[PDB]
Write an enzyme that holds these catalytic residues in place. Structure first.
Site, PDB file in Angstrom:
ATOM      1  N   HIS A  10     -20.963  -0.453   4.909  1.00 36.75           N
ATOM      2  CA  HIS A  10     -22.287  -0.915   4.522  1.00 36.75           C
ATOM      3  C   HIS A  10     -22.325  -2.439   4.437  1.00 36.75           C
ATOM      4  CE1 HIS A  10     -25.990  -1.519   2.226  1.00 36.75           C
ATOM      5  NE2 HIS A  10     -26.339  -0.341   2.701  1.00 36.75           N
ATOM      6  N   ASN A  26     -29.222   6.381   0.251  1.00 40.54           N
ATOM      7  CA  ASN A  26     -28.214   5.535  -0.380  1.00 40.54           C
ATOM      8  C   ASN A  26     -28.746   5.002  -1.700  1.00 40.54           C
ATOM      9  OD1 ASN A  26     -26.217   3.769  -1.087  1.00 40.54           O
ATOM     10  ND2 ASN A  26     -26.620   2.305   0.579  1.00 40.54           N
ATOM     11  N   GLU A  28     -28.287  -1.272  10.441  1.00 39.54           N
ATOM     12  CA  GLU A  28     -29.073  -1.910   9.400  1.00 39.54           C
ATOM     13  C   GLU A  28     -29.085  -3.406   9.677  1.00 39.54           C
ATOM     14  OE1 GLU A  28     -27.245  -1.232   5.551  1.00 39.54           O
ATOM     15  OE2 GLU A  28     -25.233  -1.547   6.378  1.00 39.54           O
ATOM     16  N   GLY A  41     -33.338  -4.924   1.551  1.00 43.29           N
ATOM     17  CA  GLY A  41     -33.869  -5.368   0.272  1.00 43.29           C
ATOM     18  C   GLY A  41     -34.875  -6.507   0.343  1.00 43.29           C
ATOM     19  N   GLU A  53     -23.572  -4.497   2.417  1.00 43.93           N
ATOM     20  CA  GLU A  53     -23.235  -5.097   1.126  1.00 43.93           C
ATOM     21  C   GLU A  53     -21.728  -5.154   0.926  1.00 43.93           C
ATOM     22  OE1 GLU A  53     -25.849  -2.488  -1.071  1.00 43.93           O
ATOM     23  OE2 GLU A  53     -27.561  -3.588  -0.261  1.00 43.93           O
ATOM     24  N   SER A 110     -35.269  -1.592   4.688  1.00 44.24           N
ATOM     25  CA  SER A 110     -36.639  -1.589   4.267  1.00 44.24           C
ATOM     26  C   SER A 110     -37.444  -0.431   4.826  1.00 44.24           C
ATOM     27  CB  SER A 110     -37.312  -2.890   4.620  1.00 44.24           C
ATOM     28  OG  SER A 110     -36.711  -4.002   3.991  1.00 44.24           O
ATOM     29  N   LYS A 119     -27.245   3.370  -3.921  1.00 43.56           N
ATOM     30  CA  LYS A 119     -26.564   2.131  -4.304  1.00 43.56           C
ATOM     31  C   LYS A 119     -26.158   2.184  -5.786  1.00 43.56           C
ATOM     32  CE  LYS A 119     -28.911  -0.392  -0.643  1.00 43.56           C
ATOM     33  NZ  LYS A 119     -29.494  -1.704  -0.187  1.00 43.56           N
TER      34      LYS A 119
HETATM   35 NA    NA Z   1     -28.966   1.415   2.584  1.00 40.50          NA
END
Ligand code: NA
Ligand SMILES: [Ca+2]
Ligand SMILES: [Ca+2]
Ligand code: NA
Ligand code: NA
Ligand code: NA
Lengths: 250, 250
Positions: free
Chosen positions: B94, B9, B166, B172, B96, B212, B11
């Site tokens: 996702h 990914n 996740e 992150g 985010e 991570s 991003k």
């Molecule tokens: Na990701």
């Protein structure tokens, strides 16, 4: 005298071939620089349409843009990416994004700043729903939308702002605002700019009409004193209908 | 024995040149088909990365997808568009997008159906926040997320589903779940599939770990019985670190 502005919002339409063809046909038809003309393909076709616009006056734009400049924002597209594809403009706050997707004034205000800081010009979309209109709330809505989106902008930043008035009842419904109704809304928006941001900004900022614009109704709309062009939806997907609207803005 | 799945990914990162280079370097390094490998560039670079992946086993994917198939959805990208760029996969849900952008379970469930109906395969992202974890709510969250997103799917449609766990605290932050913590979550997710959708679906569906992931921690994660690969974030932006994770899944 504001230079007119005609933008084609292709929305979530066109194959790659159709995008190239539409871009090329519009580019070939725009043979002077008297009207600012821009087309807004979906993200995946931006580099391809940018290519076919080269050598023409026609600008490229994106239909949305991230509120962030880079990083961990899965699914988002940054101003830097848009600029690299060749974009000069981004639409922000389109009614479909406000009302169907659900974008907030906080998000919209951040997008406006981020886009401008990174070097894009912005077409800020606004307008009222049928429910708001029927309850006479349109002026409350216009004020909330314009002042929230512009919060914190410098006078200089307004130089890269276009406002698009789209009544939500007019989008995809075949029910255009009468030219007189469009003019009333545009005049009110311009007054809101004047009272908070001053005469120079009010009189210089293009305010364009969106919503069921067609080659048959554009002349009446174009003639109105506070209407500076069009944000074109469905009619932008055929080059001849889009160009008819461009030529009417001349 | 589930075939492992390693997804990158990217991003909201990479220039066009960097995207081409990264795609090409990953393609060249994937020299067998023992592990399913896919990379997920931002929308504007999809056709360019699709090109450099040609002739390799590496699949292309998008970081998000519209809940609609075509039409008046300004700023949205349709399954048809993604398929034309060369995508086989779309990420949906996702963290985010769920927590920063604000995507609802209704929207996510619609996206899953729309993507599958149009011919994409889906990487469904899920996972709990720090606040949820600290209050021992992770199993409630996992159940809500998995059963809401999968609501209405046919048994056959599950054949094109990958689930990515996740933990939001792991994205992150440089704070990876221990392999044992990842394994506990994956085992619970697999149990939720089993109890509602049956043994065949539970035992066949890849559940991959995100958060991570780095070349230094992938081996411990990969060895866990219910971990079937990785959804790789920052480490996917360098070809060598991404390939190290791919090779560890072999
Ligand atoms: Na990701
Ligand atoms: Ca003044
Ligand atoms: Ca069974
Ligand atoms: Na927001
Ligand atoms: Na429009
Ligand atoms: Na929704």
């Amino acid at each position: 005298t504001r230079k007119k502005f005609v933008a084609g919002n292709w929305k979530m339409n066109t194959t790659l071939a159709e995008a190239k063809a539409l871009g090329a046909a519009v580019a070939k038809g725009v043979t002077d620089d008297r009207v600012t003309v821009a087309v807004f393909p979906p993200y995946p076709w931006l580099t391809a349409v940018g290519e076919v616009l080269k050598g023409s006056p026609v600008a490229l734009g994106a239909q949305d843009v991230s509120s962030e400049k880079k990083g961990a924002f899965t699914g988002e597209v940054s101003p830097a990416m848009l600029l690299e594809t060749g974009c000069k403009y981004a639409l922000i706050g389109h009614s479909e994004r406000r009302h169907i997707i659900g974008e907030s004034e906080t998000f919209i205000n951040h997008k406006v700043h981020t886009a401008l800081e990174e070097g894009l010009s912005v077409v800020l979309c606004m307008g009222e729903t049928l429910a708001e209109r029927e309850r006479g709330l349109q002026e409350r809505v216009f004020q909330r939308q314009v002042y929230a989106a512009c919060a914190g902008l410098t006078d200089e930043q307004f130089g890269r702002i276009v406002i698009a008035y789209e009544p939500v009842w007019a989008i995809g419904t075949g029910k255009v605002a009468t030219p007189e109704q469009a003019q009333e809304a545009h005049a009110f928006v311009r007054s809101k700019l004047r009272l908070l941001y001053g005469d120079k900004i009010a009189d210089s900022t293009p305010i364009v009409y969106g919503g069921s614009v067609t080659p048959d109704n554009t002349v009446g709309l174009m003639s109105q004193p506070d209407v500076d062009g069009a944000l074109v939806g469905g009619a932008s997907l055929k080059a001849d209908s889009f160009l008819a609207i461009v030529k009417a803005a001349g």
